[PDB]
Amino acid sequence: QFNANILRNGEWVESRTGERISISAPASGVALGSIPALSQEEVNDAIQGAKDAQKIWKIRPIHERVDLLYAWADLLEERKEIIGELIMHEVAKPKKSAIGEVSRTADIIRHTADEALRLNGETLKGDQFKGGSSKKIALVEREPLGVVLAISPFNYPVNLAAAKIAPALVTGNTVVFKPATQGSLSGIKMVEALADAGAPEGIIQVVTGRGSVIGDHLVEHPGIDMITFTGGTTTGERISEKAKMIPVVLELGGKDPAIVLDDADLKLTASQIVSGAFSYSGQRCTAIKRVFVQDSVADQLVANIKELVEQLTVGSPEDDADITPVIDEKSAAFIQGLIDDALENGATLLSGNKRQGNLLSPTLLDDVTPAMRVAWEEPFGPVLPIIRVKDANEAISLSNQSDYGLQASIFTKDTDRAINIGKHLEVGTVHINAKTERGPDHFPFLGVKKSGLGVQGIKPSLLSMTRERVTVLNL
Amino acid sequence: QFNANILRNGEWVESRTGERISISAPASGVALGSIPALSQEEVNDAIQGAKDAQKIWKIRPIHERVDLLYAWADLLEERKEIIGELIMHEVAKPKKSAIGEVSRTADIIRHTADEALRLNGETLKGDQFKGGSSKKIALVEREPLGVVLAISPFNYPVNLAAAKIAPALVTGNTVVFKPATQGSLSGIKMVEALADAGAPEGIIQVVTGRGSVIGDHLVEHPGIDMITFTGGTTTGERISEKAKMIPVVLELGGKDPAIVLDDADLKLTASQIVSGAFSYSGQRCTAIKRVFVQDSVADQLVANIKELVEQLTVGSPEDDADITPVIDEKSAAFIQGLIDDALENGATLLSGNKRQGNLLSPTLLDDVTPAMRVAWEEPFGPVLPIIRVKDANEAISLSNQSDYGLQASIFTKDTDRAINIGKHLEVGTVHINAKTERGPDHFPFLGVKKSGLGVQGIKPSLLSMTRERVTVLNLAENLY
Amino acid sequence: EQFNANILRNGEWVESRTGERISISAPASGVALGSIPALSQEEVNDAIQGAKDAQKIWKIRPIHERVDLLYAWADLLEERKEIIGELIMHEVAKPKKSAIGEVSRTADIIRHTADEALRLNGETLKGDQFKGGSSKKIALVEREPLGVVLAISPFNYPVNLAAAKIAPALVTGNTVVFKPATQGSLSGIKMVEALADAGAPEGIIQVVTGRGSVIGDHLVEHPGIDMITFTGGTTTGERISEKAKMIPVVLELGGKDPAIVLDDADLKLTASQIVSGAFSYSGQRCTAIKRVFVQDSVADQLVANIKELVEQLTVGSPEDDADITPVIDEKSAAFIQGLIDDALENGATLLSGNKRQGNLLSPTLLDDVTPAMRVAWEEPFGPVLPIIRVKDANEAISLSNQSDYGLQASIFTKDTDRAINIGKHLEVGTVHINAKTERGPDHFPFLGVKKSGLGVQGIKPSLLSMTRERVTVLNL
């Protein structure tokens, strides 16, 4: 198997404490390896090292740092098959979108380097403001914050790790990197390649273990200058609460509404709804989790959707199944408990209320109501609920009633109204006539309300991991 | 003389609690007037009244929003006499400087407005990124965050209040506004204008009360979408820790250093320091608070500075004096304790240690050590410590040893070295051959470490009051 | 009362040295409105030099001072919108409220121009951003005025298209030699009377007058000129580009904007917009709907709608705000007729108009117009609107792009995604979806391709055309 070490100041080490955590494959239950469970003291060592490595790192010329991201991305790509195999086993992701995770990461890395390389400064004259003297000029550059705490979830163990690391590193920051436990092995092998690519000692520090044990020690630590975090809303809110006096970026849970209207292409609506709701078996923060369909077209759409839900494969990740088993029992019983509240309240089961351990069949539900839990709570599994609506006004109200606000879809041939409906939605991104999604990666990515704080995507990521530095000359 | 009311939902009202708070002048102690003290009922009412008004405000044409700002600024200019003078009685700020405060704010508002109109969107095609879609276009725009809590200090009652309010309203947030209790009667009048200019009902809510009593409910209230604060560093800490899941902008204290080399113009350098440290009796966040002078010129710099300080006038704001009374007797006492510790630890008194009540003679202190408290602690009073240093490297070290990092000044004829030093300083803004200042307001403004959180200025305040709003379309590919 | 105008040079209000003048009349009345000096080749020379000498002292002025000049020039304009207003009404035969409306628009343009220059910012770049580059090098990129700007405006908007070129020139630190149209010099001068009184320094703004045919080529070829901005006919614009040398030339010329009308279009709006767009200021506008392409399917009820609205347009005098007022002159009217008379003879359907009493042409609608007819291509600059019936959008695009012009276009259809896609195939500056064509709002970039123009306009793009990159490289 894979009994892994962690990177601190350029060497691969274990816990001094000698203790590990076991990592199995969620689909088969089979042993993949282990990771060190690090103490708070080993977390102090990581943080202090990175701090000291940053002072040398910020000084490196900008092209030196981008050359590193480049060398790292090249390495990730030729390891796509292998890092790919690992991811799919570790977190049960279908083989192809798991190999495709590594490629995409490499792409995010280079594009991130490229965009760093053209952050320019700006000059301002004093007198561009009334009063302001004719003879002073402000030179405004961009400065790294210090040490970045980057915490990533299970569902994109490489992509969500690198998308935080890379904009932090290329802008002169150093990183302390905490992968989700399920996902650590893939995080580590990603960092393996960053160091074979010649990364300097201490610039990237990996901390592993008991996210419930070391979690706060990381988030509250004085050596941490900024935090990037992608995960659940609960853990998201605790970080926000327990970090202080530092920039903090959060991308959290979603309950992305799909508003389907009178005059939608129902074939395309159906294809896009399914594809968005059932990708990686519902286990995505950005995904359709809610459909609000006008009554007149409801039956048509619901049959259109049911037909595609029946098409979907369900089985092994090594097979490229559409539906694969969810992450653990915690999750699988939570999903099942959501279908439960729905059924015993009037919901019509249109398809697959089946459960084979962690393998949960693609569940489609009709006649869902405000009264039901599945209407509001992020399941993180392969269950989709359909709500029947009188008009767009009802669809917007129920959209905005969610505490979530990541992305929304509008399906309508009437493009003008679709844009004006979107303005009324309280989310980061609206998608007209298409499924919600984080990519392509150069597009800003954000949620609001309880879905997040801060803005990601290539260039917003770089912008948030730096601050303005001003030198005012007096000619 | 001024028993102010507060604006809730378009109406100038009192508290249902019946209770007021008297505000007397620090220059003497004569009573200027009073301010409502609101309960957790009237605050939640304001937040509700602000949250609901923003649904209509946010859908207004942006051009209508800016006009309210133009109309509000003009009204303030008309009233620079009556309102500028309220400031000088309230926070005891020199008359000319006070009227000048009201002047700068209108400019700030109009320039804020002007920038709002140039807030363009951006478009992105999907295949601008590897494997992305040629037939997708993101319409990226800005969107208001919602209800902004604007908290401001006694420092700049009007200036620093409207500096938060104007960018917030123009981008289509509504505002719940908490002035400093002292400085409230000043901010209130400032608002009277915004309401006179025609402000829609509820877009600007004015809350008033003891701050130590009602401030934590405000900070943690789930109806607030964004906090912007300028005040004491202690209270900043509170806010950052008690808020969560919202943007938070804090502007906090400073121990701004001046570094003076051998190859420096000792007249200009001296003049900049006395201008920047002793302005409004040093009761500014951005102010030269400690000088690191090379000892080869220490004798010469200290002399230059001793002279100009002696030329500063001591008295009442009505009389436009250079040195005015500090805010209250608490502050007065804390400053004296900073002098006494320095002097007990072997510092040199160069100019007036004297004080008359809350009026405190400007104090020059030489041969100050890292051992003395005044070398580190922000006095917020008319005291200036000179610390003799051997070179630039030792001056950086100590400068950087502070928990503060707002602004700095490096004085030298050699400009290449000053840029090279500046890069090594953990501050937001470096001033070559000039004092530190927040102005001009279109310059980015930020402190690092314990000095602040986030960025400001005209443009950067606007961005901080907003978020990306992306719309992604399909494009047709073939008709032909 | 007769306004006997003088022109301003080097801070002084002067006459011609020869004393000779050009009389200027009301086109809608016949009455003399005043006159203008007529200047020698050598008075042109005294203006230009006196502007080169001024510019060296004006570029040094801090930006806020230049901005405060624009702001005070705008204020007086607004304050004078009634007198300047009424004058334009007379001098170019334009409705009263759109005369005043021109002045207000102008004072808004100036003010938005002033605040936009106030926001031009420098850039810094490090050497190693490009591969191989040095990390020690830092470029400070700024913007330097070009020097002396020749601003030439037409009779269309004698104030607005004059200032659209002056205000962005002056505020960035250029000086201006301003050549207005003869018909319109009076108003153009009352505009500069206003810049005079705001406190403009000597030599900053030089007015030159005289017939373009006389003094024009001298002005255009003059080595003292650093940049030209021109608004007028396609003929003159072409000539200017041919004669100008070694300098940025920005031109906005004629247009034959199509309105493309697909079958699924809302037809009461489409007609409403086309009528407002074709017949405003009686068609004498570079940006105007000058030809309609409509699918056969809906061709009949559209043309019926258009015809209804044409018959409600008031015709006559500028003082009573007639929708249609008399064209610019008889030569102007005779060109229009020859275009109508060609269409009539070549087989076209007259639906309305062809009435006239001298200068005052009634609104004219032409159905069944073909590519065989001149009026399908040639800019009439008059109150006539041809309609060309078409099988589908592919033929409309084709026929749109066959024209020499490419200023603006309008696409009327309920299918927005398609209208965008169709627009991308139109060789024009700006495509308007479900709306008429127009130059503004003024912050929108405004330009023609092909024979419609060269270089970009609109508030900001104007600002950039009248400056150039200045670059200081430091070795840290």
Place this chain on the structure above:
Amino acid sequence: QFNANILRNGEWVESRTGERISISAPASGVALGSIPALSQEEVNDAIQGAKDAQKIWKIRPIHERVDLLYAWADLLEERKEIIGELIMHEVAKPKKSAIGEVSRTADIIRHTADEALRLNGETLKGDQFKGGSSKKIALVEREPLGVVLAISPFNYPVNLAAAKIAPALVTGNTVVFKPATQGSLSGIKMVEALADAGAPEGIIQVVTGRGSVIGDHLVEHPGIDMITFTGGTTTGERISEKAKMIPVVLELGGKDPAIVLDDADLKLTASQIVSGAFSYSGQRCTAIKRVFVQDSVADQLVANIKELVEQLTVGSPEDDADITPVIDEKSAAFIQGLIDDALENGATLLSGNKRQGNLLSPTLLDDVTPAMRVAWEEPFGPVLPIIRVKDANEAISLSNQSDYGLQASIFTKDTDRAINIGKHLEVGTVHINAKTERGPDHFPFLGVKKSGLGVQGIKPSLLSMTRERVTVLNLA
């Protein structure tokens, strides 16, 4: 040996005229190869072929365009050993620096493509200007100009070709390309890789022939939508005079001044000046070509300069000598004329005025005056004058009196002072304590006055080969 065919519509052809032009290696006067002298009609086919192809090419998704540039650069890199050799023999460019030219070309192309990938549009809203409707929205993208005419010189037969071609194509223009006759073989090979990269038919056309013969027709052809030119000032002015209604960008000659002041670090200065002046034996548009030195430190600078100068290697391009034979005999004689004029007027010869055919020694000249031709005329050869200057004002004034305004250098310890001296200088780019140069290639590059028109550099090229396309949507 290299009998080049040219590229039309994806086929490799000789001329229909049947005529050819012999190209000889300037180091040895031996035959290298030949090129076709096209007719006016072959130039017309070329223009038409690219006009057609543009309509399909402008349509391609941005990423596809970008992708071709990349494949082209990887092939040029792969090919740097053979193209560099060909540049070396065609233009007598020191071996390594010719290869380096190809490496510089690949870097410029890749970066260009990357910059093109980052061109984003902007949305403007109606009421962003006073009066504007709240309910409409302008989408503003960049649209290609059409067919670009790219004219390149001899001394960067690839880098200065590609710097034009690369951003033309990527933003969706097509290119008609006139390389210098001397250097036409390098270009053809540069283009061979582009075709090998899979450039669709007609997006890149190569026209070879006498600029004296085919140049005028080409520059005046209405199929041409833009011209970009690097060469002499005399051709540049001719081009600008003759072209019309299209954008034109010129990079012309220069006489780059080095100002050396009292506090100058004279070691660094000497170094910077000899490196900047004598690269490619002075056969560069940007290069220090005159020195204004304060007479207080003059004798010392010239000594330092002399040591380095007498230390430059003189010989064949194959041997990587610093000083290589100049381009042709015409050149060698125009240079001889300038030395003679200076000596025959008093100047001090401090280092060689010695020849072997076109192989000239680096000549240094002291005691140069504003009366010698070499004070002013661009030598385009290994000759450097030094002028004794009282103070900075003399330095400034003497700099500006020149017709050229490309770049300048300021040497002094006082960096504030070097900035304000920079301000008062009428040039494109001022370099503090460093030589003049075009690079790094993302930096804005421009001449003013007789030195240029418009702007180059990576991103500014992209902007100069496109224009705004507006689409106004209506959400009400």
